[model samples]
Target: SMEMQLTPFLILLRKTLEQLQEKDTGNIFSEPVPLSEVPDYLDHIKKPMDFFTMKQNLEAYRYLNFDDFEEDFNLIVSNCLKYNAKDTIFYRAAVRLREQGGAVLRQARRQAEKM
Candidate 1:
């Protein structure tokens, strides 16, 4: 079983989907969250620059914690290519991953301040 850290953003995402559902014009036959759309969506929501820039900042690992990055990376980057979670629970989980992102940097900065 997989578990994710819950956040208020997940609740907000739930609410947003509820509203979108209320306004949904199509049924189960609606257009999918397209393969092309996935990359575009990530590009839009992503922060600029590398998350860790490994070659230059390997030391960051001591301070940074992705928490579940390795696990979720399997879904978001790997499985996302082969499977379409569009408009399904899998999609919702993916959104939660996206919404709860940056714990790595947040932890890194916090640790740096205490240095």
Candidate 2:
């Protein structure tokens, strides 16, 4: 059953990612943060997440379940919020991405369970 569920779930994940990438703030979270640009980033964020890494993980079947995928997804938002000040656009974008992207993931999960 796990294998059977995975195919559809993977499809859902891919679709959700595409939708997320289309968001206004998507570009910011789409790629890995450049260490050269942000020299202090690693000092503050222990674990960094991005859509590019998520895509690679998905293709590699690194995620065993939805929870694992969700963890990485949340990390992207949380890390952004943690690194950027509340007054910054990056912080505000993370807030909106968290709310909007979170809802989409929830809906996808529900749909996956029904399959």
Candidate 3:
């Protein structure tokens, strides 16, 4: 199926990243590690069938909003697997990651709103 746009998941991850920045005093680079410490940042997936606006939007969000590699790298793996799972095993891992992230988002958002 070529209908999946892979937007919702990227939005969720970017939102979570924004939450992280907020919690860290609106500074994303405050927790930056050396480039070598973050290999997953642009690890890359196979490739897109035909890049569209939705795909480009996700990339722009990942590049512009998130100040780290983990989000971009992991999110790509996730959306790719969801769009085409058999092509890579990384998507299965993304499922667990998204679950953990969702839990954190739920807990953090409640805390953020209270503040």
Candidate 4:
């Protein structure tokens, strides 16, 4: 019954994720950060997030509620902003994606409420 109740929220999450992935800079956050290339990444970022990891968590049902999902979603953006300089493309992309993605999520939330 819990799984059934979560169906609509899961659908909303997937829909929002799809749109985020379609962004021009989506590829930047698509996979895990390469520790081999960026050795200092972990030094600066305490928690890292990416689309691949989010998808895996979703598949595992790690998200118990919308708040959990939103936390991870926001983490992806916050991590980027924290690790990358403001002038860098990565930082800018995170900012843009957050704005665009946040709007998508908001709209999806309203739709989900109607169901």
TM-score of each: 0.26, 0.91, 0.33, 0.87
Q: What is candidate 2's lDDT per residue for 3-103, written digit by digit as tens?
A: 45677778988987777766635499889988899999999999999999999999999875678888998999999999999999999999999888888
Give each model's clash number.
0, 0, 0, 0
Error of 4 at 112 (Å): 3.6
**Candidates 3 and 4: which is better by lDDT?**
4
State the local distance difference test value for candidate 2.
0.85
Distance (Å) between predicted and true CA of 40, model 3? 18
Q: What is the model-wide C-alpha lDDT for candidate 4? A: 0.81
Query: Model 3 lDDT vs. the true structure?
Result: 0.42
Encode model 4's per-residue lDDT on 1-114: one tens digit a residue. Answer: 233467777777787777777763549989888999999999988888888898888878887566677788898899999999999999999999898888877776676666
Judge candidate 4 at residue 92 and give its lDDT: 97
Query: lDDT of all predictions, in order shown?
Result: 0.35, 0.85, 0.42, 0.81
lDDT tens digits by residue: candidate 1, 4-89: 33343233333333333333223221233443745664544332212222212223232132333333233332333234357775
Sort all candidates by TM-score, best to worst: 2, 4, 3, 1
Worst 10 residues of 2 by lDDT: 1-10
TM-score of 2: 0.91
Q: Alpha carbon lDDT of residue 8, candidate 1?
A: 35
Error of 4 at 47 (Å): 1.1
